[PDB]
Symmetry: D6
Subunit: 170 residues, 12 copies
Amino acid sequence: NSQLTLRALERGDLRFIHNLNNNRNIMSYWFEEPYESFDELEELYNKHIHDNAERRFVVEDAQKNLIGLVELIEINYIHRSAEFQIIIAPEHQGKGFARTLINRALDYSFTILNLHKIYLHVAVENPKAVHLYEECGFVEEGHLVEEFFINGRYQDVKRMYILQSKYLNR
Amino acid sequence: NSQLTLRALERGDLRFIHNLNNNRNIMSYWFEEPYESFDELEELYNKHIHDNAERRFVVEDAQKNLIGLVELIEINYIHRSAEFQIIIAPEHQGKGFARTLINRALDYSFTILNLHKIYLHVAVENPKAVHLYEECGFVEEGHLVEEFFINGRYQDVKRMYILQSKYLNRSE
Amino acid sequence: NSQLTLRALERGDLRFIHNLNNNRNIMSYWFEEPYESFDELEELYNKHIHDNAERRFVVEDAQKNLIGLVELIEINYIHRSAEFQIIIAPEHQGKGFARTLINRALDYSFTILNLHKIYLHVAVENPKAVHLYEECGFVEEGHLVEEFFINGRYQDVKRMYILQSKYLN
Amino acid sequence: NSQLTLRALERGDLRFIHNLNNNRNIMSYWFEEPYESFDELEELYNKHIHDNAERRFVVEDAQKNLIGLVELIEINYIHRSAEFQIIIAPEHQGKGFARTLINRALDYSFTILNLHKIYLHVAVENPKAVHLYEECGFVEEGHLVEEFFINGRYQDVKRMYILQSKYLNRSE
Amino acid sequence: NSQLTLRALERGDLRFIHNLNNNRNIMSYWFEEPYESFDELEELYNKHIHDNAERRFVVEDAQKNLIGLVELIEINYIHRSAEFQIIIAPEHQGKGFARTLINRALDYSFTILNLHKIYLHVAVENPKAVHLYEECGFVEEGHLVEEFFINGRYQDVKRMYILQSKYLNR
Amino acid sequence: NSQLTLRALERGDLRFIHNLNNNRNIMSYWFEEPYESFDELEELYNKHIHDNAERRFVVEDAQKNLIGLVELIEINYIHRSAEFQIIIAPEHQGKGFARTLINRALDYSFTILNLHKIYLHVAVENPKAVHLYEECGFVEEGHLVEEFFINGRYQDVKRMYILQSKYLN
Amino acid sequence: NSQLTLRALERGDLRFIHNLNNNRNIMSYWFEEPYESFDELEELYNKHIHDNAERRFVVEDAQKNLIGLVELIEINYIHRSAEFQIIIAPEHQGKGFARTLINRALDYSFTILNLHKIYLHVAVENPKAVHLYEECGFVEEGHLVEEFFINGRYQDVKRMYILQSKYLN
Amino acid sequence: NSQLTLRALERGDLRFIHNLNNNRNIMSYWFEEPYESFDELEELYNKHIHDNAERRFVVEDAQKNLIGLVELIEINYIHRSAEFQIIIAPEHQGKGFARTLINRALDYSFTILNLHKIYLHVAVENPKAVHLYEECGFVEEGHLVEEFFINGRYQDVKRMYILQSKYLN
Amino acid sequence: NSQLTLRALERGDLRFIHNLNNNRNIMSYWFEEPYESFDELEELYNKHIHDNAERRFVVEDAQKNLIGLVELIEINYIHRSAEFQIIIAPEHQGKGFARTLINRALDYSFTILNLHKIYLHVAVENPKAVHLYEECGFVEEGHLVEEFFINGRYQDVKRMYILQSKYLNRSE
Amino acid sequence: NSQLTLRALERGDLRFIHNLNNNRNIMSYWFEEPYESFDELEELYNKHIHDNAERRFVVEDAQKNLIGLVELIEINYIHRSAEFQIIIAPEHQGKGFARTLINRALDYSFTILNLHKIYLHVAVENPKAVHLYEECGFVEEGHLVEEFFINGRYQDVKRMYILQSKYLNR
Amino acid sequence: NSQLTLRALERGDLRFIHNLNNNRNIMSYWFEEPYESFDELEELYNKHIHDNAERRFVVEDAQKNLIGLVELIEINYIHRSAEFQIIIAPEHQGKGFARTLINRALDYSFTILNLHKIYLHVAVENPKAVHLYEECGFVEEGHLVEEFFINGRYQDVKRMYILQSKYLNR
Amino acid sequence: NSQLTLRALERGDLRFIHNLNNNRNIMSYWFEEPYESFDELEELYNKHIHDNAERRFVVEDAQKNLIGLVELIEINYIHRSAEFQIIIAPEHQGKGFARTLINRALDYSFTILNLHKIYLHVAVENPKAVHLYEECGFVEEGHLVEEFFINGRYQDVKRMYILQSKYLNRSE
């Protein structure tokens, strides 16, 4: 709803990030290993403070509760593309925030950074995630065979995308 | 009214700057992307401490509430010019402070720093500010086409300026 | 099963780690010289923060009491093997938690890290431990002669291993 | 024919790399901007020397003429995948070396480095290369729309891949 | 003509740059001071090796003679704009290379970096330079009063621009 | 015997070392990924200059032609063990020099460095090498299962060792 | 006389210094641009800690209230000259303390630092100050034309000096 | 006029500079202690490469023979003033080149750097030089008493200046 | 009695070390100059943290009172020897702890660290300590003449030592 | 008396040192300038932590009151000489501590550092200081003409010395 | 003879040092391992340039031939003692240089550094080395049991010493 | 005679300095230990380049042969004093250059550097130099007992000095 906002990741938010990053159910959706020392996380945060190739956001509601995370990575400024990734804390999954956040990230991407294309990756074995994204405007541009090793097996992922033209003329 | 005071920005004012630097509406007037972790801001602040090409001032009232920011950037040592930009916190806007601060900035630029020229950029779609600036003696020297991408599209901005000779000598 | 969790080692867990490292009987299991300084431990921790060739984990119960430690070292990314080490604090041994921790270290190695082989070393003079590793599917691949100097004399150790294919099938 | 040899790139090969990195035609196949001072190249080379996420190989003939470059990047330690990219110097192109080198890269990736998957990107408007790659066992897993801005417009690329199990076991 | 090319500035070209930078007739066109130690020039070259906000080019003919310089500065990757500046060595002024180079720089800008806008600055007192640029597609978007101090006086400069759409649909 | 000498590795010997490291058949003996950059090799050399946990030696003949290489790594100063590796350039194999180099590496380990145990790894698929090590007094202490990924598949290696007491008596 | 003392500037006195530096009327006396950041002031303080070419002193009364500041800069050790600057906080002007501070700065320059010449600059538009310096023995040696840009226009300043021989006799 | 040019000082011109700095009679004009090390000169050159508060120029003739040196120091960007210094090597004095170099330094200060005031110091005991500066439009603004210790005694110097407005009209 | 415990020295024990390092009487037994600012001690401590040629242990009782220090230095990786030195805080001296700690140090040196030889130096004018050490199995291997300048004059010291084989096997 | 001791200077003692160093009556006896920022003093203390060429001591009584300072500087280890300097805080001047401290410093010098010679400097205009030192064993080895500028004038100082042999055979 | 001299070790002499250090017959006399990369040797030389605790000398004859090495280590400046070690290149062993060099090192030690005691270590199994040193004034102060592991065995060494008083009153 | 010239020491003069710094006889006149690797000398040279407390001069003849060295050290900014020391290479000694150079050093110290006092130390057992210095106007202000250990024993040195007022004004 109206009460959801995206603001930049700050040092004070790292305990919430850490807590998610050490949760394997949550990190499987980012095809990332669920082990990260707090120090690894903080030192990488420090290292990338001035990195222009990424934007990391925390999501809050009106009381300032941390709902989840939005990220734009691999921002390329010739091709004007970037990869979008999102995580909703367990407690907040299934409340309808998903679409709002995807929209907010697309708005950031398209009305602020002036990117041309946003793409994401989703487990083919999560076909309800796939559909969601389709309803939010994304379209399948690839079916990556055995791209990621997750939970003892290689899994297929859809690569999906959306263009600036489509998002702004809606 | 007259109770406003200028002083240089310092580390302890940065939570206030940060707050404005993450406000979409406020930053659109500066054509700046509204995202800055506190760490990026502080690190850049630290790096520019001895940088002569800029001056960053904070505006406080008698009881020390932080009202706004006045800055001069791209200060050039030869051409004696600089770009002026101003921000008034939203809770303190529409209180007639603009003029007062624009004049403090002009007075500083021309009676202390000895610059010859000050210019600014203002969105064309912001005619109230254009007007305000004109009344404060600035004059349009350019209409930059599709200069900045703001809130989903390319926009035009006025470049306006004022000379030290004009400002100092007007009433003479 | 459920209550015991595994998370990455943190700077705040270092006094727990140091305390085990001063028990010489506990360090004899890792063939590591006991009695190391807290500062050495901390500075070595700082240095390996981004070292991808190791994973150090702590074992916490439901109330967040530190039970012990599980580590994977010498992780090799071509051969996809690593050495496994485990320590259960003395006040939590005999509670039957070794098995669950071993299974947890194997789950991590094989379902997340995607390694092919996990091996470990055990003193031959610790046949109870050897036996526990045998039940968890480890097989002896070496009987290393006078490999380590422990408590005044050279001792033999067993090298034992398990493959990913065996753990996942 | 069979007289080609692979070895790791080293500092003394950089004038050759530089030459290719400033060639517009050659770099368009890598979707890379064709501008790199020697200094940027050397500095980045130096920085990545111990970087495990990449392997850069040079191809030499019996008399040591530098023919091309074979690289693997984004090597991931868990997923065991990497992106393959190749370049053959223009004076040595159209001499049937492609296949030979693509096979050396596959043989390295799968019989030495123990990767599970290799992928590449090829412009859709480059059907000869797509075909060549297919014949070398790669298979289309995606048609990326308007992925790269090349020579004035946004273009589609095929993402193609090959698995270690398929490659190792085909003839069995 | 066909024989003119743009390649990246290299360390070996710095003696040619220096020689131009210490020539006041040449630097007045860039509103820059004609004093630069070779060491200042080289140390600034070293410092900006990895700067993404600029591209500096040397211009040569077929025998590899240094004809002049092309530069794109203040590249901004949200607004996708940049400032273009050019210098033709004295010996090569008046041979018709000017238009080719402006075209080459626009081609780099528009077919490679994917920028939206290119702008430049010209002395109002050089109205034949102004016209040239007008014929090459640039249009006046400003008349900057007393913007630069040059040869003992403050001088007016036109700010001129061209958009990607116009350059590519020609 | 006499003609072959052993001296420490030097920066000027690095092109010889690099050249062996590009022969994949030669590097398969060290289970080391071949094709490494000269700069990586040099910078790793620079970094380990004062590392007391390794000794890298070159083997020179009477005319100062580089024959091969002998190294001692993972030298442990409590357990007093180390791993031995040896490479004889291809143009000097079949000349019967392996034996002399092994004996020379053992002499160094046991009469100068005062180590207690020397071990090595050998591919099981290289029974000639195993046999040579057996004649020089090494005994198998482990048959490591699928330890290394070589030429497209996991292979077994032998771990073999000799003690100081046996070499000196 | 007695109550007023002079001691070296300290990091804890910096907020006092900063506060004077924001009064533009106070900084006009030093021809220094007012409104400088506390961090710039502190970092410049840190940088000059061991700079032998300056001495910055604070003036304290009997109750340790900061009265003002006295500085000696561009101290030259061959020519043995230095430039003198003094600032008396506004809440302590008109108390007749300038004289005592000048005499104190001269005593320091000539009886401790062993300098030969002390000079200063004063705005011509500040004839009261010029007059005070004249009574303390300073003589005009220069009338510098349009030397500084102050409050919107170029102004003339006096350069004035006193020698060691004159102060000590 | 034409033949004499001015360009920025370069590292390759340093032996020329050093050579003047060892003539004590030449350095007396700059009130600079002569006999400074080449290494000090070079390292100070390295340190000031990006210092915007100075410009050091060399004077070359048609055949690229170094004639002398012209410098602008203490350039202040608010007050827009700077101090001018000039040295003509002894083998090129009496050739009437001082005038052209002064005019060239003023042209640079006022038509490029956009300064408002240029000043210099001259020993009173050098009335020929004072006179030359007077012809080039400089006016005495100060007679500094015993400002410098030169050749065994304190000497007076003249401070002289010219404004931009006067030079440009 | 048996309630003593050894652990490695750590930063927080340094005020105690400092106290002993500035005690003239205590330091004369170590032939060391009794002057060390806390800063010199901490800086050197920090520098030797990863230094393998030494081990520094603190001795604590059941309630954690710091009793003394046991150290081994000049640990040589080849010769497998080290110099042993011990200090018992004065308030805890003459309580029969010496033997107990000397034995803990021997047990560590020979059953954990696998050294072959431990030696120490003792002032000749300190016959009680010589004797104590002899009873603990050390044997005189040298009488160093005028080796150290102590309390105004040059003095002789006994160098005494013990072998691992002797220590481990005595009772066999 | 018995209750006076010498211990090494520590960081915590620097406020007492500073207070003396900014007292001109006290620093004149060391021919030193009475101006030292606390930061200068502390940074020089940090720099010389490992300097073997000096030993700086604080003097206390039984309640741990800071009485003054002892210093051995320019320790040379071939020539085995050093310069001794002492300061007694104003409050403690004239109580008879002087001789005890000189003795303690000589004892340190001669029974611990094993030096051969200790020398000092005293204002000729303080002839009662000269005599004291003579009674403590020092002897004049020089009368340095106008060696130091102090209080507006050049002053003569005696250089006095004592040898280890004499101190230990007493 | 007269033609033997001691001068400080220099970088240019390191190839001669290296050559000796990688000769096990030569390094056994210093109880040192015969393996040293040239780089290890040079980097340690660089590190110890300013170390006051040692003096390393090269020995030459009149034509400037490198004869061997003299070293004074563990120089302690309170106790005024140091360890002396010497090596004569193989080619020059048995020519009578030994005594001259020991004398030269003692002269350096006693007439220049002003040390009180010099000690050395010798293999008990080299009793002709022991006697030599006895004739040069050294005397046994210890018989160190199994002090060093050399050539596959632990060996006993004599510790021998000489005092300044004895060397200078000869 | 008069053909001598002073200039500051520079890096390229260091082989000459090194040669003198390793000469026992030459260094005994400076009470300095005659051992200095080239590296120690260069490193210290480099470190003192901007050190104001010293001046090191080389003496050259018309054809640029390096004759000797004149130095001033411990230059104090307040007391305006310095220690003078001189060395003449042995091949050029006993040629009457001493006086000439001592006078150049005095002329520099007093007419350029504006010092008030110069002093030196000379071995008592070196009466020829004492005398020479006296004739050059220096006067004994101290007889330091057993100040330096030289060639096996402790020796006395004269401290001699000269004032700027005396030197400048003598002939007046």
